[PDB]
């Protein structure tokens, strides 16, 4: 409990702040010398991901955007708004990388980000719900939007990426498989965590999310920005 406010999870919120900074700085340092046209677009977008994330973690660290929601079980919970505002801007940027990688139309991209934004906001509403029946409704509403995200990713984007070269479609697939597995752990951890079953306390959960967040931002970013697939001057 670094800030001595009863929340020993700030331990994780801190490491996450740093780790996200390091990833951000690493991407910038590495993108500094890139001249390739399209490659520079991917960097700009991806740099913002851990960038925005480290700023949301610093806030959660100082416990800047948290409120309480006393459940019906008498046990009150503290909800971090920054976490959701983070995912609200970050997940759309990661999806953009994939959209750019697949070369899909602007209409499909708008729908993609839309359902994705709907996923985070509903997940927010649920977290803020008092009864376990309400939290499941909002959770189902959110997991559905997520399945839709996965759907446009595994059909539209993928079939469009299929038309690109092997180099590009090989990375799209890799990153789309990563997203499919990695992102699926969020609804799970959420429902088994403090918002659902409670098999995990506020501590370990915060640590698990941080590990997922970093892998989904710095790890994803590393695999993408490190490949030739972002290279492009087109036709």
Ligand X SMILES: *C/C=C(C)/C=C/C=C(C)/C=C/C1=C(C)CCCC1(C)C
Ligand Y SMILES: CCCCCCCCCO[C@@H]1O[C@H](CO)[C@@H](O)[C@H](O)[C@H]1O
CB under 5 to 8 A by kind: which of a copy of itself, ligand X, ligand Y, none does 190 bind?
ligand X
Q: Answer with the entry of a copy of itself, ligand X, ligand Y, none that 117 interacts with (C-beta below 5 to 8 A by kind).
A: none
| Phi and psi angles of residue 70, each rounded to the nearest 5 degrees, phi first | -75, 115
Number of residues that bind a copy of itself (CB under 8 A): 15
> Minimal distance in Å, beta carbon 166 to ligand X?
27
Please list every residue from 139 through 198 that binds a copy of itself, using CB under 8 A: 165-167
Nearer to ligand Y, 83 or 169 (CB): 83
11 binds, among ligand X, a copy of itself, ligand Y, none (CB under 5 to 8 A by kind): none
Nearer to ligand X, 10 or 129 (CB): 129
Of 130 and 228, nearer to a copy of itself (C-beta) is 228
Cβ-contact 143, 151 below 8 angstroms: no
Ramachandran quadrant class, 124 (left: phi over 0; alpha: psi -120 to 50; beta: rest): alpha
Rounded to 5°, angle at Cα 194 from 190 and 195: 55
Residue 167 binds what, of ligand X, a copy of itself, ligand Y, none (CB under 5 to 8 Å, by partner type)? a copy of itself
Residue 232 contact partner, candidates ligand X, a copy of itself, ligand Y, none, CB within 5 to 8 A by sort of partner: a copy of itself
Candidates 84, 152, 155, 148; CA nearest to 122 is 84
Nearer residue to a copy of itself within complex by CB, 130 or 226:
226
Nearer to ligand X, 132 or 164 (CB): 132
Q: Minimum CB separation from ligand X for residue 139, in Å?
A: 5
Q: Which residue is nearest to ligand X (CB)?
A: 123
**CB-wise, 170 or 184, nearer to ligand Y?**
184
Phi/psi at 104 (5° precision): -85, 165
Site for a copy of itself in 12-51 (CB under 8 A): 34-37, 39-40
Binding site for a copy of itself (CB under 8 A): 34-37, 39-40, 165-167, 226, 228, 231-233, 235
């Amino acid at each position: 409990d670094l800030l001595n406010d009863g929340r020993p999870e700030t331990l994780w919120l801190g490491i996450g702040t740093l780790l996200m900074l390091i990833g951000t700085f690493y991407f910038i340092a590495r993108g500094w010398g890139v001249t390739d046209k399209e490659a520079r677009e991917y960097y700009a977008i991806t740099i913002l991901v851990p960038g925005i994330a480290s700023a949301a973690y610093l806030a959660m660290f100082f416990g800047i955007g948290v409120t309480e929601v006393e459940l019906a079980s008498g046990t009150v919970l503290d909800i971090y708004y920054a976490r959701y505002a983070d995912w609200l801007f970050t997940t759309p940027l990661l999806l953009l990388d994939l959209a750019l990688l697949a070369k899909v139309d602007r209409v499909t991209i708008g729908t993609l980000i839309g359902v994705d934004a709907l996923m985070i906001v509903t997940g927010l509403i649920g977290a803020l719900s008092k009864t376990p029946l309400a939290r499941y409704t909002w959770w189902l509403f959110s997991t559905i939007a997520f399945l839709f995200v996965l759907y446009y990713l595994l059909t539209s984007l993928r079939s469009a990426a299929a038309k690109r070269s092997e180099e590009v479609r090989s990375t799209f697939n890799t990153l789309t498989a990563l997203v499919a597995v990695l992102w699926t752990a969020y609804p799970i951890l959420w429902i088994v965590g403090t918002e659902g079953a409670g098999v995990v306390g506020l501590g370990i959960e915060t640590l698990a999310f941080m590990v997922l967040d970093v892998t989904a931002k710095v790890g994803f970013g590393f695999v993408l920005l490190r490949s030739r697939a972002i290279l492009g001057e087109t036709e």
